[PDB]
Every structure is written in structure tokens, then in C-alpha cells.
Curated annotation (Swiss-Prot), chain C:
Residue spans, topological domain Extracellular: 1-152
Annotated protein name in UniProt: Tumor necrosis factor, soluble form
Full protein segment contained here: 82 to 233 of 233
Outcome of swapping V86 to A/D: Biologically inactive
Cellular compartments annotated: Secreted
Ranges where the THD domain occurs: 7-152
Disulfide bonds: C64-C96
Highest taxon listed in the record's lineage: Eukaryota
Outcome when changing R27W: Biologically inactive
Length: 153, 107, 152, 154, 156, 112, 112, 112
């Protein structure tokens, strides 16, 4: 360690060895978590009140979606000390299969990424969480395909 | 014309009450869909004045006039207040505005 | 209790805005302070410096027609130096590959677009986030469509 | 005219429109920046000083018809550091633009796919960042700010 | 304290330029003596035809400048159509005008030039066609008074 | 439209002088560092035209316009000509371009 | 007026050189025992300027005027500079003062 | 005539802001040494306007013209305002002047 550098910061990436779950990690190469940011239950805990930049990306992969009725979601939520209800700050939905379902052929690997980012005023003790409804379609194979992070502006 | 603000320039002191009158000249605009907007002196953030509390709105359908009483004037209640109305005849529907400046001096 | 900061803005789509994109600031988890004004659906930069501009839109439709809709989303800039609308960020997305479902109707599709970048803005510059088809907006749930700038 | 000085390492490079089958990054164009020490060498950004940076890039893919079998669109921002001289992926995304529908006696139709990547990272002096795609033949830089790549020192 | 019992018609639109739109051409419909009714919708500064049929398209713009410091300035005004059958911008009506033919106000100034441009024609439009009236130099617009810049269609 | 090259398509005969004018619309670009590029018909080279002799360059800062007069025109001077200017405000430095093509026919050379 | 500083308000750039002149009006004060004192902007303690290096002094006893040329100017050397002289005639010994402020602006650093 | 003031006679009301513009005609005069003078109605001494606060000065170097916007207008700011500039070529140093008069009217007159 040479130069100090500061601000609450976090850039966590999904655990590749979790398969059917999205577990956030910080001890893996180009990942960061320092200066007060806590990771409790896959939740980032704000250490100080101020303006933050919140972002997250998720990559979905399925092997030839046979079901027209497929819905993929990705949302970053906030539970604050002032108002103790989970509300979505950033949200996105994506329909991966436009009915087109493989009939007389073989599998069709589809990939769908979703990216979210925004600036918010957060308070001390706020709990941020990035979650998806289909954690069985997670593709954490490669490296920077799924992540979640904040930086104090 | 197209709505006529009567008190054009008023100068009152902190702690008083000014009334602004607007009169409809278009027989298609209604005294029912009236709106108010304020612009604080030296700033172009024209906001919508809310109808309640210090801001009381009186409507008289007979004379086609609506007014806006502002109570407890402060030194920050100095700006330019405009009135608005929604007009509708046949296939056309539009709105109309006015203009008139307020300056409040503090004691 | 905690002191303010720097020019910031995070505006959200109006949920009760019938088929149109009106940006709002006086709603939970939204900001517009430290000089940034929202004029006629436009953000006005109050001071010279480097800003980060971003916006997301969610498009939803209840079926794939034959028209072949093209979804666009761009953040453009009008500067005092060059009085022409120029695009800073843009993206295009085609939602329908389907050969118009003739028996399996409805089937709601969702398509998002996200834009973000760093730019140098001048005093009085007007940024505008716009889309070509404001009739496919999904402003139903909170924070699905938004637009913001922050002075870095 | 002149108002405020401004500072910190920043870069926002945009693809060259007069390039064919290539993603060539340019800095000397209208709303593009490259100042405060950031160097653009071999289609690569060279970090001039250690700190926390914000990295982002967008790519727009377009084709006028659906091709055969499955084509995969890739977009990754990589980093080769002085500390570890091997290129590792910081951000990645994959996207399938053509879902079956291999045109066999049917009309072609232009598809568009954007891909965006962004995150905060700690970079050192002399690190070489590069944003690249696997199929530079589907690039749609026919309009402005549709493909770009940038960093800013926070 | 009056009464009204007026009927309606067929797709029509007559929109007027925004006066408080700094150096830009924003089309408005909620202003006196302006129309946008019977299905014609205004999206992204574009009119969307609500039904297939025979239409009359017209538009005028007024250009004003406060001096001629360039014998090489071009003012153009075009109504273009991007159609559902052919998703490409094609010109329906176009006109070009050179506002400054002289050798620039080299001495005294205050010579405001005014040059108007008018377009009109009848066309067959389909449902969902998007019409757009545009100019090349939106910095010379004279929207100071009323009915100086406008754009409209009417279903014949 | 960030500098506007005015004579888009011009057609002159061997033995002439064509003037190409460009006017700046970006208030950050300066008339001091101007460059011209010509691309000879059929090749993609865009070599840089030099300021001197057959290529005379006239600059006027008042109207923010520059021109490039080409005299004694031959048939080897037919190509697409671009004008350029160097812009700089805060931390940003860029340049701007235009466009305009020339076609030159000969004189038939009447043989006695 | 018993010592007169000529440059009251000065504005020089980092890397320049300002000359402050003081002229004696009391024929009892001598141009030999002159002193200079500066007060750094924002601080109250008045420090005494030393004779050497950046501070070169020109004295002319004929006109009873002394000056202080300041070279290699930075932006942290902006403050109120006063001149002084020691007077002595009979049983009296006193000193005299002046006044004059300098403001230095910086030149940034062109970041490509 | 060297230097042409554009606003000859103005009649603004108390609480407003007037800008007076001057254009240089001699290519020996510089927009760098520009000065403004006011002469209060009822007195003869021409005072030198100080640029700061209510008196802001703008410059445009391309056409060699400068202006002077005065904000927060009172009723005591009625007078004859002139602009000035310093010209210098070879063995010559001179200055040039213009002219433009201001009348500012006040309020009240609440007709009852």
C-alpha cells in the first residue's frame, strides 16, 4: 500500500461457484469494498449520508427458452431508516423470448444483459440490494458480466 | 387581452396581503380551470403556486373573473405572478396567460 | 443536517402523464438542486465544468405489429456556442422479430435502453432526454424511466 | 471566452465514422475529451496516475437481415496493468441479436442492439485500458454518440 | 353564462411554432387559433397520420437575420415523410432561398432581412406516416409575432 | 452545422479559378489554424494542400470565413475538396470538416 | 507625506517582477537605513523581508528615493508590503512607514 | 468617424439595466485599453466609471467593439456617458471618444 485514496466505495461481483444464487464477493481481483461499505446479506450498507452513484449489471443466459411467458427483472432497492419499506430506485424488465420457441431444432443459447445506474441521496444505515427474479439464468461464467457497486460522490 | 391581470405592479411591506385579479375576455375559457404560477425575482424557475393556506383563490362565474389572495407576505415572496385558464370550443382546446410583477420590501 | 454538495439532478418520468414523457423532481428518491433548473422538460447547466449524463427508459408493448417499430433514445445538447441540437448519447433497438402473432395474441414485450457518459458543459447549456415513441413508456413501477446529471 | 479552469484525468473517445470494419477511437472531435494526462496510444487509454476511475463504453450493432445460425455480439473493457502484464476483463456483455428466424424465403429486417458497460475500478499509473468488440463489421457509427468509450478519475 | 352546441369533422392539424423556445422550432397545439384534433397526434415534433387517405400538407417559416455578413448563406425548408411502407426520410416539399445577395453590411448595420418560405401540396398518406417540417438554420426563426411559422395537415 | 462549405458541386473548364468558401458556425473554432485536404478522383489519399502559389488562401476573422482560390486550373485538379479548422475551449480540442467536389473538362485543343 | 509608496495596488502574474518605489519627504530620514516589511494575505503577524536573492534594492541618496524589485514571483507572495526608514536629527529618533498591496494570479497548467 | 456609439439616447425606468456599445474604426486603436466616462446631469466634472459591481464591461475582439452593461439602475444615474480607447502605431499616441446620453425616469405617479 502506497497512496491513501478515500471515499466509501464498493464494486462487488457475483460468486462463480454459487450456480443457483447471486452471492456478492469483494475478494476477487479487480473488485473493491473499502472505507466503510459493509456487505451483510448480499446487501450494501451505506456508512455515511451523502450523494452516491449506484450501478449494477446482470447477464442472463438460457438454453433455448421454450416458454413464451418469460420475464427477466433487475432492480436496485433501498430500505432506509427514515421509511422502513423496500422501494425500487432503479428497475428494468426484459422479455428474452418473443414466442419463437425451438420446435424441430436444437437448443438456442440466448444472452440478455441489463444495466442500471443513477445518482441518489442516501442516509446512514441505508440497505441497498440488487436482485433478480430468475437467479437460475445467471451467467457468471466470464468475469465482468455481473456486478454491483456504489461510489460516494 | 386573453386574460387581463389588473394589479400590474404592486409594492407592499412584509406582513401584508395582496390580491391579484384576472378577468376572462374569451367566452370559451372557463373560470373553473384556473392555474397560478410564480417566478421568484431574478430566477427563471417559474413554479406552480398551490391553492391552499396562504394562497387563497376566489372565483366568480358571473363576471368571468378569478383572483389570488396572498397572505403573510415575506421578503422572499417577491417575483412575477402569472395566471392561466383552459379554453375549449369545438375541435380546439388551448390555454391563456397574463403578466404582472410583485415586489415586497422588508421592514 | 448534512451540508448540500454540487450541481445534481435525478428526474423521473411522470406516472400519471398520459402517453408522454414529463420529467418530475418532487417525488421520493429524486433530486434537483444546487442551481440545476428544469425548464420546459430540459435541464439547464448552471456552471461550467465536467458532468456525467445518464438516462434509462423502459418500453413495453402488448404485441408485435407489422409496422416494425424502431425504438430510439437519445440525450442531446444545445450549447451557447453552437445553437444546434446535437446528440451526445444515442441507442436504437428493434423489439419485434415476430411475424405478427396471428393466433397467440398479446404477449407483452419489454425493452430497456440505458445511456451514460461524461461531457464538458458550459453555462446555460440545455440537455434534453427524449425518445421517438413516447406511447410505449412503462412508467408503472418506480424508477423504470429516469434521467439525470451530476457535476463531477 | 473563459470561465473556470477545471481538472482531473478524463477521456471520452468516439468511434471514427470514416472507418470500415474497425473500431478506431478518436479524440479530436466535437464532444470528445482527452486531457489531464490520459494518453491514447495503440487504440488504448493509458492511465497517467493512480486512483479510482469510472469506466464506461457503449456499442451499437446493426445488420440488415437476420443471418444464419446464432451470431454472438461481444463488448468488453479490458485492462493490462504494469503490476500484472496480462489483459483481464473488467466489464463484459454478450447479446444474441438473431433468435432463430433464419430467413428461408422470408423478408429481411434490420436489427439493432446496444450494449453498455460501467463500473468503478482502481487503476495504477501506466495501465492500458481498451474497449473492443468481436464483430467490428456490425458497427453502426452512422450517427453521433452511438459508440463511445471513456474514463474519469473520481 | 353562454351556450355551445358545435359539431366536429375529420383528421386535421394546424400547429404553431413555440415562441419561448430559444433558437429552436418546437411545434405547439395548446395555443389560440391552433388545431390538433380528430386523431392527428404530435409525437417527437412530428405529426402522425391517424388514417389513410388524401391529405393537404402546408407549412410556412419566417427567417429573420440582423445583418448579411456572408454572401454564402443558404436557407432551406422541407416537409419530409417517413412512411410505414418505406421507412426512409423522403422529401415531399422543399424550397431553397439565399437571403443575402449583397456584399455584407460593411459599414452601418441594423439591416434586418426577412425571407419567408411556403410549402403546399396534396398527397396520399397511410396510417402511421410521420410528417416533419424542418429548416436548416433554426437560429434565424422569427417567432416573435403570431402566425409567422406554422405547419399543418388536413384530411380532404 | 459546424463550418459550412458552400460550393458543393462546381464544374469548371481547364484554365480558370474556382473559389471554395467555408464559414464557421462553432463559436469555439478559430480562423487561425486552417487546413485544406484534396482527394484526387479515384484514389483515397486526401493529401494536404499547401498555402502558396497556385493555392492562395484568404482569411477574414470578421465574418469568420475562409476561402481557397485555385488558379490556372488543369484537369489534374479535379477531386473532392474539404476545409478544416482547429477548435479549442476548455479541456476539449477537436477539428471540423466540410465537403465539395470539382469536375474539370478540357478545351478540345482545336488542331489547325 | 513622510514616505510615499508609488504602486498602491499592483496585479502581476506568476513569474514576473514588480518594482515598488518609496520617496522620502523628511530631510532627516536617510536612504541608508531602509527596511521593508510584508504581511501575508489572511495572516495578522507582519514579517520582515530579508535582503538577499529575490529581493534586490536600488537606493539613490541624491533624490532620497529607494526601491525594492521583487523577482521570481509566485502566487503565495501576495500581501501588503511597506517600506521604512530611520530618521535622526537632534535628540529625536523615529521611523516612518508607507503602504502597498500586491495580488498575484496563477497561470494554470495546460493539460493537453 | 473613429469610434461609433450605437445607443445615442436612451430612456429607461428605475430598476432596469442598459447596455451601451462602441465600435472601433481605426485599425491602430486596441480594444485592450478601453475606458468609460460618466458626466452627471447638473455637474461638469466627467467622472471615470469603475468597472465593478453595477458597471460591467464586455468586449468582442473580432469586430473590435466593446460594450458596458449597467445593472441595478437608480434615478441618480442620469448623465452623458462616453467611451474611450487608446491608439498607438509608430511614433504616435492618441485617444478617441464618442457620445451617448442617458435619462432614467422613476416611479410612483399612482394616478388617483
Amino acid at each position: 500500500s502506497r497512496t491513501p485514496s478515500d471515499k466509501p466505495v464498493a464494486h462487488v461481483v457475483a460468486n462463480p461457484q454459487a450456480e443457483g444464487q447471486l452471492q456478492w464477493l469483494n475478494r476477487r481481483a479487480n473488485a473493491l469494498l473499502a472505507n466503510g461499505v459493509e456487505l451483510r446479506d448480499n446487501q450494501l450498507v451505506v456508512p455515511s449520508e451523502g450523494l452516491y452513484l449506484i450501478y449494477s449489471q446482470v447477464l442472463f443466459k438460457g438454453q433455448g427458452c421454450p416458454s413464451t411467458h418469460v420475464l427477466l427483472t433487475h432492480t436496485i432497492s433501498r430500505i432506509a431508516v427514515s421509511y422502513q419499506t423496500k422501494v425500487n430506485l432503479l428497475s428494468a424488465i426484459k422479455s428474452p423470448c418473443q414466442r419463437e420457441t425451438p420446435e424441430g431444432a436444437e437448443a438456442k443459447p440466448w444472452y440478455e444483459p441489463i444495466y442500471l445506474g443513477g445518482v441518489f441521496q442516501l442516509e446512514k444505515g441505508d440497505r441497498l440490494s440488487a436482485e433478480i427474479n430468475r437467479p437460475d439464468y445467471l451467467d457468471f461464467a466470464e468475469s465482468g458480466q455481473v456486478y454491483f457497486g456504489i461510489i460516494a460522490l | 387581452a386573453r386574460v387581463d391581470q389588473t394589479p400590474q405592479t404592486i409594492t407592499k411591506e412584509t406582513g401584508e396581503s395582496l390580491t391579484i385579479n384576472c378577468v376572462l375576455r374569451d367566452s370559451h375559457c372557463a373560470t373553473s380551470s384556473t392555474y397560478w404560477y410564480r417566478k421568484k425575482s431574478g430566477s427563471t424557475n417559474e413554479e406552480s403556486i398551490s391553492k391552499g393556506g396562504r394562497y387563497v383563490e376566489t372565483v366568480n362565474s358571473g363576471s368571468k373573473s378569478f383572483s389570488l389572495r396572498i397572505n403573510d407576505l415575506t421578503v422572499e415572496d417577491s417575483g412575477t405572478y402569472r395566471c392561466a385558464s383552459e379554453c375549449q370550443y369545438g375541435l380546439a382546446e388551448y390555454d391563456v396567460y397574463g403578466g404582472g410583477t410583485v415586489v415586497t420590501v422588508n421592514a
